Design a protein around this nucleic acid. Sequence first.
RNA 1: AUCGCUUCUCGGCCUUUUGGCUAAGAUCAAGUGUAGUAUCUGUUCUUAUCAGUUUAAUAUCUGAUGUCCUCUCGAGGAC
Lengths: 62, 144, 250, 161, 77, 441, 206, 81
Amino acid sequence: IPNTAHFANVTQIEDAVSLWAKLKLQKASERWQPDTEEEYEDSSGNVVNKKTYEDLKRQGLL
Amino acid sequence: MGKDYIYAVTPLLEDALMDRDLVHRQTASAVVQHMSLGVYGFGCEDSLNHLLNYVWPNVFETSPHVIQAVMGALEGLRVAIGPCRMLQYCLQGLFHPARKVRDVYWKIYNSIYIGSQDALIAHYPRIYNDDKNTYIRYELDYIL
Amino acid sequence: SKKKLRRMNRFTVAELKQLVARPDVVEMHDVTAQDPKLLVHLKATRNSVPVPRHWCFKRKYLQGKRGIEKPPFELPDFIKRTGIQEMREALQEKEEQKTMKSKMREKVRPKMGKIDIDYQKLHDAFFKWQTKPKLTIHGDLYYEGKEFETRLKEKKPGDLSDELRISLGMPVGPNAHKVPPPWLIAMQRYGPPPSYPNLKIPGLNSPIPESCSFGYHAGGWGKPPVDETGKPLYGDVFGTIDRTPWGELE
Amino acid sequence: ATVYVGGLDEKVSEPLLWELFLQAGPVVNTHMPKDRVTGQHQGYGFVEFLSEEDADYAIKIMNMIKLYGKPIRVNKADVGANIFIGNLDPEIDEKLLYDTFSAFGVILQTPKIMRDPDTGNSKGYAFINFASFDASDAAIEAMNGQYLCNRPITVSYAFKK
Amino acid sequence: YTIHSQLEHLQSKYIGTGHADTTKWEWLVNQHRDSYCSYMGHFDLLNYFAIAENESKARVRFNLMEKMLQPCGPPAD
Amino acid sequence: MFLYNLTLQRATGISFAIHGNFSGTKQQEIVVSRGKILELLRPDPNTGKVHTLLTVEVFGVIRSLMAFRLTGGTKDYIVVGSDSGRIVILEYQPSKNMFEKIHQETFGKSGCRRIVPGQFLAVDPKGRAVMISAIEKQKLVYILNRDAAARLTISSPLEAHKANTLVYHVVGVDVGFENPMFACLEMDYEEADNDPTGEAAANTQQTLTFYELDLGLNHVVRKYSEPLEEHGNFLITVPGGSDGPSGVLICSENYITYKNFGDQPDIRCPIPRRRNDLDDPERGMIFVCSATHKTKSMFFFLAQTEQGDIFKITLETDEDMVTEIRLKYFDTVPVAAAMCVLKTGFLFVASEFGNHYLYQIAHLGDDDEEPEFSSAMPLEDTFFFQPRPLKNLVLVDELDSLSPILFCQIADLANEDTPQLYVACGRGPRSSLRVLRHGLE
Amino acid sequence: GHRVIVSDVQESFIWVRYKRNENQLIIFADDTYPRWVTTASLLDYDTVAGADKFGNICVVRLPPNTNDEVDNGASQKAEVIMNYHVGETVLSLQKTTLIPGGSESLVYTTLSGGIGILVPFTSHEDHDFFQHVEMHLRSEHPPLCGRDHLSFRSYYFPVKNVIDGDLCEQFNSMEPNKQKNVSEELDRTPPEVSKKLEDIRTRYAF
Amino acid sequence: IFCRKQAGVAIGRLCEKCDGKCVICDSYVRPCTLVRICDECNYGSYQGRCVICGGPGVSDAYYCKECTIQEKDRDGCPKIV
RNA sequence: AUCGCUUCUCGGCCUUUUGGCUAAGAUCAAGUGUAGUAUCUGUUCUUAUCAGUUUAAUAUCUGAUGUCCUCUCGAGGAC
Ligand SMILES: [Zn+2]
Ligand SMILES: [Zn+2]
Ligand SMILES: [Zn+2]
């Protein structure tokens, strides 16, 4: 776990890991990830994400 | 007609608010008080902000004259700079562990409150509501 | 005592940091405060300004400036320009040399109008060359040593200094553009550093700085790093609205 | 990440040190935590570039940079540690030379190529101040007769002029 | 400390002040009452709310002055 | 930047009104208050057209407005309570066409505070004293005497500082040359903030109370509290002195009540509603504004209700007491910020959102096939009535107003060269989109 | 054309950037106050005018040197260049010119039937003129209702760079004695003042 | 020490020693508004006295323009009794 | 060259230290009231846990010195 300030004065390691655990969760939350957010309709009037769109796109349909 | 020489004088007051002595900071504070009451309404608020940065640290003080000229500087600066800026300076130390700092911030906030208690209504923070109380003000965030 | 139980309410710093929505704030003594959920929401509000450092200290806030020696105040340029300081230095040296008897003799028979300094010199300083000093925006309280912190942490790659150029072998001045530093050389050679892959090097991953020179001697841009198929190492190492104010005076 | 600022110059200030750290890459730490008595620079410092290859190439670059006018080296944190290297490849550059001869040690003097002055094209010899005499030994051994750019290398301990 | 006789006379003088022990509940409830007194006083936020909900100025000010009594939950303990 | 601020069209919406002979004559003038503006209109009886004589800036907030007549003079002064810590006294000069400041009394700090007086202000019906009052902890009273030259004077003020007490209204009670005295509502948030359970939130009662002067001893003594059944907004004053009894009509939700202290047994009456309406089973009903026509013959009140319906009220009274109440359906007009019931047979219905109206009275609101209601009529059930178009009132005048201007758009959206303004304005059913242009039709 | 000025309900205007090729929505500059905005307007590429629920109009400007493209709670912020307490809730601003060839203007339309304009100045001669006009007018012709004009126009945050045309335009309805006194302080004739008063509405509005 | 029992309409006055200063701010300049005192510190032998010296009321106590900008003049009879 | 001298030259920076005489030429040096701040000056302090009070945290304050015998805070042991 990096030596960022957020844990300074937390000295016990299980506390540190659960702290940085929720911190990790929050950083991943507030990240905008185009894979799951950025979303694509196929031609067929139904929608998928960026990832799956390119997946089935370049494995030979879209 | 201080709206002219306020710029010329600032770097000398910041010079003497970074320590030189008790009396040095007592007197630079008096100067800030009177500049603020003169330049009320002419837009030279960036300069008085800059000098707030230097006066506010003297808030924890003991000598009667020194802390008194400081408090005077903050009333002058309150009319001249507005009560948002000074409520923000006074936010974090209202509920501090200590008691010397709690007491100085409640002294200030009292004087900020007595005069101009009615602006503050649009300057208070957003203070979330826990279980058995309601603390948000939904009145203010009706859309329209 | 009665406190002995509110002290058992006195939660853990991990209790706090996990509860809170913004964990950067949580500090040491935060917990002995009568209302830490408030205190932390406040300290995490926008634009607010934290208590000084020095309420803890047993070392006095200014009395710590006690020790050193300090140089006298330095006037504003536009006031030096008008040449007051030399008038005053001269008068000083005069009256430090003169003796008591001559002092009172000049008291009784004054040197009326010894000197002069013309207006429009003053009035033009104060009304024609007066300029905005450097100010600090909301929040940045001065503390003992606040001024000592010096503008650095220039993380936007391109940040170069003139002594840096000299003691690294590169040029200072208008040639800080057309001078690719000795690190852009191995940027072109094996790549720019893989924690500044969001940094492009000028002349190595960026285009020619204004009027740069391609060539392989000392003083040029060399081979802009490119693939064997022609696409550069990144970006373009070779190189291939209406902000008018509405109310403004004529 | 952590780089030894060696030959750490006295007055060459940590501020411009970090400005060069940025002008090379990730200026994350520039520190020369000195003697608890002196205050001046303590001959070896820690420069953290938070990217490893960034610090690597920044080190290859800021070696031989004339700190206090003197070449100071960014490395991993004069009794004749100079080696003569002949049959020399004239087709090299100076940072290429520092990175080719710095594999077995620091270079306290970049390879000075004994080239003719009439033209600016070399006749095939040089000498290079490395870190150690065992460093010159190992490097000159791995490159004794071995594959230089166009004229195969021939390296060993250097003569004194 | 006669200053304090005057100063808790000041606390008795200005409903809404504080002292170093003041509780989040007193603080926020006093600011809430003041907010109400000014929504009533200023002739125009009244139109804002009157128009935001579909009420009418008598309805509006009657609500407000009813709410003025326990605006922020029940008390602390 | 450097800007200059100009208002093209003043604020039009009306907030307060008074009616009085503000030019000394018996032609009556009306003094209304826009936002930060005091505007005076005089309604001509000939056409029925109201000429807006004097429109003045005051640079403040008019929180309270009340006219008064000195005991026997022919003028109509104005007492204005605004958001400075001052009470101000105003008069008309038609000779200069200008408002004139007679007196000026500071009593505190600026801004629309909470414990500094100015929100409520009442007078004594004869013109002897004024009371200024806040919504907590403060009320003062000023005494008024003509000087020798009859130019008004005003002495120092009295006090009634009582902590932890709201005020929903204050009003002067009509006594006959006794000590004047005032009926305020009240409340007491005190306990409800000592109880961690929220019980005292419920179970607290408005206290219709009277303070009293003592001009001899020069102080204000608390005479008469009485715990009222339920909070009601306000108190209509009963024309006392010689005419009428004394007493107050407490306009509480669903119920209007006569009440006066002394021997009277307190008088009730439920409010008659319209029948077969489409309003939520929960929605109460409150009396919004009132206006009283007290004339040579008799007196009566009008009070209005949320759906805009006006009612007539007169007092069925024996010797010293009144005995019972009759509210009989008059008509329904726009919702009103105020009614100012003239003589000369009109009344000013100050709209609250949109164009405000001047009606003329046609029939006293008496003796037709509209039913009769009463405080004596017992019942298990309510009354009702079925409303109808304008019977007793005739729409003389219609003054325009943009209040509220909920949205705008500048453009040139007719083939004309100069731009028009497209103002989306008005509330609910009475709303509209209205075109403004620089031309005159 | 490619910037966004979002305006939240309580904090402020918040300048947001759309970088298309990475297709990001990223913050670079916001304000230093709380402002319950009701509607904003754009005056240029860096300047935004705002209304407020409590009465005020303000004009906030980005500093001239904004690092537009990059990747307490902000990085760099904007400044405030004017502050005016109109007096009623202002529900729509718009940058516009009214009469043909008239110089630009700000129309503000309140919630009580009020409509008006804020109009720039072209010359410190105009500026200083009305500046002094009203600086005397406050002193010798205060409002009726007890108030002070400076404090009424600086109800919430102090005034900055706005002159009160509706106090200036009161010189007309003043009295000959005072009309003299003040126009003589200006050492212009009441003709000079009143014509310079009227014409400034003439070239902007009607 | 202060009276501060609330204000009124009775002007205050200054002895000639005390002539010129503001009541609290202790200024010497730019006085804007007149002083008012309470009835209780108005009556009797205290009619027309020096709020500061106690000397005879001759010149009028006034309010330094700073004191009026900060409205420290809206508290009432500030008599040091 | 040495060693003894003679003279001169030079270098330090050292050392020297003033304008004679008289009736030491003559003469003579006039601040508070209040508090209070700061600075000097003088001076005074080994305890081993733990419980609490307290404090942002220390500290302070209060209380006996792991228990038991015993000999001189110290010691051998049942533990
Ligand atoms: Zn004073
Ligand atoms: Zn008194
Ligand atoms: Zn005196």
